[PDB]
Amino acid sequence: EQIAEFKEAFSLFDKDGDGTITTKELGTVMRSLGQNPTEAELQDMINEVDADGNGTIDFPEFLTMMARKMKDTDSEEEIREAFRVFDKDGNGYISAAELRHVMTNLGEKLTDEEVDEMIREADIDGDGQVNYEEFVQMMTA
Amino acid sequence: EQIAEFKEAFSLFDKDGDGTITTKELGTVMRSLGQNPTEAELQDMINEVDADGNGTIDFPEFLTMMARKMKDTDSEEEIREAFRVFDKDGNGYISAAELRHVMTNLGEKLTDEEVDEMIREADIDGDGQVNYEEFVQMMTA
Amino acid sequence: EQIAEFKEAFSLFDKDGDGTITTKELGTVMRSLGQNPTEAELQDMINEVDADGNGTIDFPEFLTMMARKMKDTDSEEEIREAFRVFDKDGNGYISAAELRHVMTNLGEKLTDEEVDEMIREADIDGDGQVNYEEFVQMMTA
Amino acid sequence: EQIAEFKEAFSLFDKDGDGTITTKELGTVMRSLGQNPTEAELQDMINEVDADGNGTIDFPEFLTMMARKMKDTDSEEEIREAFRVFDKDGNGYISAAELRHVMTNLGEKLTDEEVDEMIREADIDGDGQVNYEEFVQMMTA
Amino acid sequence: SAAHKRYRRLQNWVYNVLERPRGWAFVYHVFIFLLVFSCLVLSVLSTIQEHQELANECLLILEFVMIVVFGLEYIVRVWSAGCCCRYRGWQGRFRFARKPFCVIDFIVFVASVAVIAAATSALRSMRFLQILRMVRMDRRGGTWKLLGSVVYAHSKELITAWYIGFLVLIFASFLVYLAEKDANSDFSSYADSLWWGTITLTTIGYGDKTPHTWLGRVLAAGFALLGISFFALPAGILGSGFALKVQEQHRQKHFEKRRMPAANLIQAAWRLYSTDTVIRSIRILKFLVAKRKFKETLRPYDVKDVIEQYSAGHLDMLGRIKSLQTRVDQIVG
Amino acid sequence: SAAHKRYRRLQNWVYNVLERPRGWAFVYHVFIFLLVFSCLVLSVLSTIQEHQELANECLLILEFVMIVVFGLEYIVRVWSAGCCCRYRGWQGRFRFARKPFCVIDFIVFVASVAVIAAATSALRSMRFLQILRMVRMDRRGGTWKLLGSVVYAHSKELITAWYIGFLVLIFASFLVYLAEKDANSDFSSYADSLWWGTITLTTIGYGDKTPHTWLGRVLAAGFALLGISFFALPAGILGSGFALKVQEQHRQKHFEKRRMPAANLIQAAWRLYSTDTVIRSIRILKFLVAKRKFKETLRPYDVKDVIEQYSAGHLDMLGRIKSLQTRVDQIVG
Amino acid sequence: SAAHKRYRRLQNWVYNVLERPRGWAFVYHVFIFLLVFSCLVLSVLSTIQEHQELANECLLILEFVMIVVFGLEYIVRVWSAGCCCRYRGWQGRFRFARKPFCVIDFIVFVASVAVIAAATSALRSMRFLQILRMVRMDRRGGTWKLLGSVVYAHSKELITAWYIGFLVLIFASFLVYLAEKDANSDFSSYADSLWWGTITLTTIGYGDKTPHTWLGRVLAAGFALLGISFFALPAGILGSGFALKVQEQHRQKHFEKRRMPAANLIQAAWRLYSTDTVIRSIRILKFLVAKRKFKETLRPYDVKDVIEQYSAGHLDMLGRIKSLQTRVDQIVG
Amino acid sequence: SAAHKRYRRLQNWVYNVLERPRGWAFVYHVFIFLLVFSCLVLSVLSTIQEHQELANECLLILEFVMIVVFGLEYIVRVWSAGCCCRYRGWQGRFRFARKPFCVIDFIVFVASVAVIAAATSALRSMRFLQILRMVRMDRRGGTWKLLGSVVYAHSKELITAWYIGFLVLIFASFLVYLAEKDANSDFSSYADSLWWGTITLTTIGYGDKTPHTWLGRVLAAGFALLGISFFALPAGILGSGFALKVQEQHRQKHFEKRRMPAANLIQAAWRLYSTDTVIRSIRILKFLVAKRKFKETLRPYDVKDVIEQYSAGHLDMLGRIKSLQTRVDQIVG
Ligand SMILES: Cc1cc(C)c(NC(=O)[C@H]2C[C@@H]3CC[C@H]2C3)c(C)c1
Ligand SMILES: Cc1cc(C)c(NC(=O)[C@H]2C[C@@H]3CC[C@H]2C3)c(C)c1
Ligand SMILES: Cc1cc(C)c(NC(=O)[C@H]2C[C@@H]3CC[C@H]2C3)c(C)c1
Numbered sequence A, B, C, D: 001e002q003i004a005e006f007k008e009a010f011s012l013f014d015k016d017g018d019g020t021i022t023t024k025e026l027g028t029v030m031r032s033l034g035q036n037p038t039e040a041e042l043q044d045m046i047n048e049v050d051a052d053g054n055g056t057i058d059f060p061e062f063l064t065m066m067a068r069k070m071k072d073t074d075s076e077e078e079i080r081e082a083f084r085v086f087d088k089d090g091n092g093y094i095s096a097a098e099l100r101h102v103m104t105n106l107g108e109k110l111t112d113e114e115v116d117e118m119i120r121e122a123d124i125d126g127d128g129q130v131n132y133e134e135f136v137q138m139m140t141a
Numbered sequence E, F, G, H: 001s002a003a004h005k006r007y008r009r010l011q012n013w014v015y016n017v018l019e020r021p022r023g024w025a026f027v028y029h030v031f032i033f034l035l036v037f038s039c040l041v042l043s044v045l046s047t048i049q050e051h052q053e054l055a056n057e058c059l060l061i062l063e064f065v066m067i068v069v070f071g072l073e074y075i076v077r078v079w080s081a082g083c084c085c086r087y088r089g090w091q092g093r094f095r096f097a098r099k100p101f102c103v104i105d106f107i108v109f110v111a112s113v114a115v116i117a118a119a120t121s122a123l124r125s126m127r128f129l130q131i132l133r134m135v136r137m138d139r140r141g142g143t144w145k146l147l148g149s150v151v152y153a154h155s156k157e158l159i160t161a162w163y164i165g166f167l168v169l170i171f172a173s174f175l176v177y178l179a180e181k182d183a184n185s186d187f188s189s190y191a192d193s194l195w196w197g198t199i200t201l202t203t204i205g206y207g208d209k210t211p212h213t214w215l216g217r218v219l220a221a222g223f224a225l226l227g228i229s230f231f232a233l234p235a236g237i238l239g240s241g242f243a244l245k246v247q248e249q250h251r252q253k254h255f256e257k258r259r260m261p262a263a264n265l266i267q268a269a270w271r272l273y274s275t276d277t278v279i280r281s282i283r284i285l286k287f288l289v290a291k292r293k294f295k296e297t298l299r300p301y302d303v304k305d306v307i308e309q310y311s312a313g314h315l316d317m318l319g320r321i322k323s324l325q326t327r328v329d330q331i332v333g
């Protein structure tokens, strides 16, 4: 039944029944929701799961990505390595205020409400320090 | 007499009698038959046999290519190496159905009728497995 | 008080009070004075002090640059290395006439009046030879 | 007096008396004689003698090139190395007919009359073989 | 808990200094090393008839101070394991509840203490296992990690070296043994011949066993010239691999551009997590793009990457002119 | 033949495990190695007066089990040579009808069996040729292939090393022989001097022969400082070549993009073959383009490649903008 | 002061020749080297009972000439320290007023002169410190600078080599000492075992101490095969690092394009200096751009620059088209 | 002269085979080598009391055949020096009239013949100079050219190795000599100490001289661990340089595209020469461009080229867009 629900999502992209998702199908569904990816961003996204290298996503590749999410060990390690960039002490901790600065000032910045939900979800200590390795296991569970 | 027949084909390209084939002469004959190579594809083709590096094919280079076809040992080895990409067992076999998938789904895909003739020509075993190294010797004979 | 005077200069660039200087703010003030930097020159200038890598200068970065000027040891060494390019003897001397040639004929050439002030400021010896390492300490003091 | 004759040629390029030859001055004199260099060819030519790297030729650089011609040892060696590309025997000989083929069919091909004068000038042996190392010394004398 | 906080902060400082070495605060490490070294020094000064009283009293005082200091160091290590609280002892339990390096050292310490209190072998083999206790550094294996990585990288080819070397050893030992079996009494057996061959091909050359006939000498010279190099290859292979790896370390640490990729990966992961089907599938794809860009900056970014983006960018350039071309042709002509 | 098919499938599995090693199924290899090693172990334990009865019975039982196991292994190898049928025995005949590794092992096995059944030399030299029988792995030469490739690559320069080293050996041996001929009795002849020189320059240095006069000592020191390095170059050259080749292996396997090129090549070859003059000439040219692209993706792709398409891409750019410029001229102006 | 100027010019020439070596004017260096070498030669020719009179008179005459020449050389060095005037003696005072290489040599010279005038140890240890006096070259450390840089670059990994080697030394010495303690009298103590282990693992192999039992022989062979390589790694690591650094030097000298960057930097520095707030802030930013471009050309310019500039330039080109495209759509359609 | 032409053609063939080796026609080289080797073989078989009659007759017959063959080989070499005519003897005179390798071999040959016809030293030292006569190959220095180039490239750094090694040698020899002067009789003098130090630090380790006190042993161990590596650096440096140079040879032989550049250079040179002021100055500039392009293709082509040509092409493209933009502005808007 989980496979059938993935198939129904896959068919929203591949409305023609061709069994593939190209940049046209992916980007069309995304822009209908009000997103505006570039062509190079749509190619990068498809390339992450396109083993055949022909610029498409087929259902086996789609199902694999959906079943896996972030649960794999590669994801847990890399996310933990990203936090460690901002942990100079090396003790596995990061300050709530330092997490807030990085999340709202670097990269694809989180909004205030996004970052508020993120700090609420981490079981912050009374000092104001966050143990990010248990934060990584909650996102990889 | 075989040399004279190659000369007559060579003269269809080099209609001016200049003794050379450029991208103009090669591409003109090709498009007359309904092919549509790009300029970069015409340059690659000429470059494979142009030892002088001046962007032309002369008759000695043309004759060498025509006399040799695929009979050389380099061709036999590389074609056999290409099949081995798809032979994970390492036993020199490939399934008829796996050959069909690769021929019609990768690269410059074969049509159904092309791939039907190809599987008919290989002496397929009763299991449905193809010994591709004897398939390579039939194309290199 | 020195910090407040730097802040007042910083606010001429960042007239909106956003706490940052982009190529727009920097280049606008520069062109008002009759300078004409290119976009790539404005990016290089900001990149020299932009630790966040987001294409801006904030006040802490601005204050650091203004407080430091050329007084740091890296500046003294590199300027001295630049003179040594033109000191073949290796004795720490350069001729007044050779300094004049390099200053007015290479790079962003000095005008005659600029180079006249520069040679006046170096305590030229009676021969006409300049000890450039004490010239470097006067610019790094 | 030889220096003064070089100066008079140099002044045809640098008609303004600025003491320099840029691509404008060089290319203008060349096109007046009916030559048609490209901009990239004019830059390459100036770059061969521009030690200052500022895109100009000054009179000392012009005089050096004119005084030297091909008489230097680097020129003799490189020209001799070029002939040796076409000497497979390694005996320092090349056939008159092979020299004729290379001169009129490769590179900036010599005309028939140019190549006729070149083969007349080499003291060809009765076989038809040319000792090119003594040909190189006549051009480097 | 402010005074408790400050005391716990000093405690975490001492935890790092006993746990992670730094540029300057290596005095604890160097003093533990000096303790073990001095103990080995009087151990070697023993067994030459000096343990009469001057080496023996030194042994007693050093064993006393050593037992005391390692007891308190174990105490302080476990007692400072974590941060201020909930880490100091709790993730202490979390770590040592099941660890192949936590309680084993305790077992060794208590067993040696029991043996000593209630010959040379016990004392010394205890001490060298204490040099393993200082191997502990960087989780017992920093140097071991490095060496293992480099050895594993050159596996097949070290195997070539070892295997050819061993064949030459065996076959040369046999041939010289046959050539020297009658006259020379050094080559009594074939095991003697292997001893000679091992000492020769490694270029130690004690000289206790040596060919005497001319046939044996010629064979030994030939096989030496042929196998000495094979017994010296592993050092050359490993040394060159080491130097190359250092050069590459320079090359890649010159990149290290994980400022934005670092932060962006956490953001794409949070955005995906906070989703909780098509909307989720899009966030998974973006997460996977961010994870790659995050790894790439460290080391997967290479020279192939340049050409990858060249093709992409220049095809865009070719088609940019074509965008204008279609326009021109459709209107003006 | 379904039960036959399944039995033949298990048989092909055992063929691979006895033929191609893998990550885990190396137990047959390691056990054959252990058999040969243990046999060599009791061979070396012999010849020290222990073959009285305990080594002798072990020799008998090991020779018995060894003959039995290699007989059945040869049987199974030939009997599983191919796949289910038409390969199991037929390409078996096709392979062993004329092969420099098929029947030679049989000849060796039967000859040794005849010799043993119906001194130390026979037993041992048979055993070491059995270590060659385990050299058989990867067609007798995997390690040999690797070593030969690397040696051949550095040929001229190994030659330099060897030749300079040998000149120094000869000339130094001569000079020291002259300087030590009268006093020292070690240097009785010139052949003795060569023995000394070989042992010295390889840095074995047994010490049985040694210069005694000061002139000879000075000459020996000079020639040692000058030639020892030459006798150590080959190991350094080979080791560095090895490490460099490993690094390059990483570099090029990071590419390995022969998914589509492989298919493309088979397709162009089939299309050319199925032709059976101008139409054929075009298919030959396309076949040759596909063969090159197929090799390139593995390793011929270089750094010149990057700029080969740079120039090409800029040429396209130039072409289209020039066509555009003339277009503008024609219509707008 | 024209005659003074010419004399001072000759004096500065002699200052460079005594201070900075060149392609041809190394005769002073080679003669000082020859003086020290010849003095060491008669020092070694002494202590074999030849200082009767022929070595002793040579010692007297050489000590005489040496004291004289180094006195005048010190005089000339300080007296030619700088240029014509204001540098000859004044920056002479500026340099030697507080320098760890200026007055120390004077102290050594006067102390040795006092000792000699008013056994072998004094003479010889004075002479070798004079070979350090010729170490003085390139500020006492040209070779030392090079070696230190390369050693420091490979620090962690030399540490791996040393530390594993030393563990193997200790543990092997112990095991062989236990295996050979009873029978063999070479291994009387454990200190003897360390002597044997050091001589073995370095592959010197004197042969004075040697295992005699089979257990000890087997242990020694195993530990030799395992540790000899570790004692040979440092040479391999350093040699490969050396060769790699030379290759990189070729590439660094291929660049080194500081013709205009040098001038540019001096100009931006002068323009900033001559300012003496917004106008100054702009000159500081331009100075910092010029300092970077000045360093980059020498070495910091990397491959990243090319990739970055590709993206930049490609986007400039794309933006060019984009501006034109919007224009076209506005007017023509 | 057609029959003369054919005979002269066969003569030039034999000239190449005696002068330039090839893949197959090395039989003359290998036979000259075998002649010299066999002569050295009976020379070494002499001086062990076998020159009674069997070695002596062999010496006579080999000296006879050797004198004969080298006479005729010298004859044939000079007589085939050039091509058919005007080169066979005339550039023969042109070459040997003044050459440091032409008449010197003749002088050596005639001098040795005079000495032999009208002890071991003459015969042998003649023979080894004949191995130099086979050094003659590739102008006496192919291997020498290679080795000299690589040594010269790493000059400063080999100097570092040698100089640090020699300091350690001297200072260690001195310290051990002092520590061992009284008890040990091996270290009678300081020259003995240098002999011991040379044999130790090179890791030969004869064992004739060996420290006996514990102080001397400790000093020797320390200085061994510190200097052995320095005496082994040169081999590592040279070997790594060798391997790197081979890798670079591959890299650059992949380019080697001097067909058209070489062809164009001859044309620009002829066009300049045939001129015989502004017209000439232009031909000189074009000649200099062609000479550079001709060299570049071989090896000066670098990675700097890539960066340079990218910028050039990018700006050409940008300039073309500028033309297009100005057109649009002028007409449409
Ligand atoms: C024949 C032979 C010769 C030798 C020197 C070795 N040993 C090595 O090469 C050592 C270097 C690494 C680390 C321990 C090994 C492997 C082996 C195993 C076999
Ligand atoms: C002078 C001399 C010194 C030596 C060490 C050798 N031998 C080697 O260098 C060995 C390493 C490879 C493999 C066997 C050879 C070649 C030779 C042949 C001549
Ligand atoms: C175990 C061990 C073995 C050795 C050879 C050394 N020594 C070296 O490796 C020398 C090369 C550099 C220069 C002096 C050191 C470091 C050390 C320190 C420890």
Ligand SMILES: Cc1cc(C)c(NC(=O)[C@H]2C[C@@H]3CC[C@H]2C3)c(C)c1
Pocket (backbone or CB within 6 Å): F225, F226, F229, F230, H161, H162, H163, H165, H166, H231, H234, H235
């Ligand atoms: C201290 C010392 C130690 C050594 C081994 C050498 N010799 C070398 O290193 C040899 C390798 C090249 C070729 C001959 C030299 C140079 C020297 C000169 C000094």
Ligand SMILES: [K+]
Pocket (backbone or CB within 6 Å): E203, E204, E205, F203, F204, F205, G203, G204, G205, H203, H204, H205
């Ligand atoms: K030795």
Ligand SMILES: [K+]
Pocket (backbone or CB within 6 Å): E204, E205, E206, E207, F204, F205, F206, F207, G204, G205, G206, G207, H204, H205, H206, H207
């Ligand atoms: K020895």
Ligand SMILES: [K+]
Pocket (backbone or CB within 6 Å): E202, E203, E204, F202, F203, F204, G202, G203, G204, H202, H203, H204
């Ligand atoms: K040794």
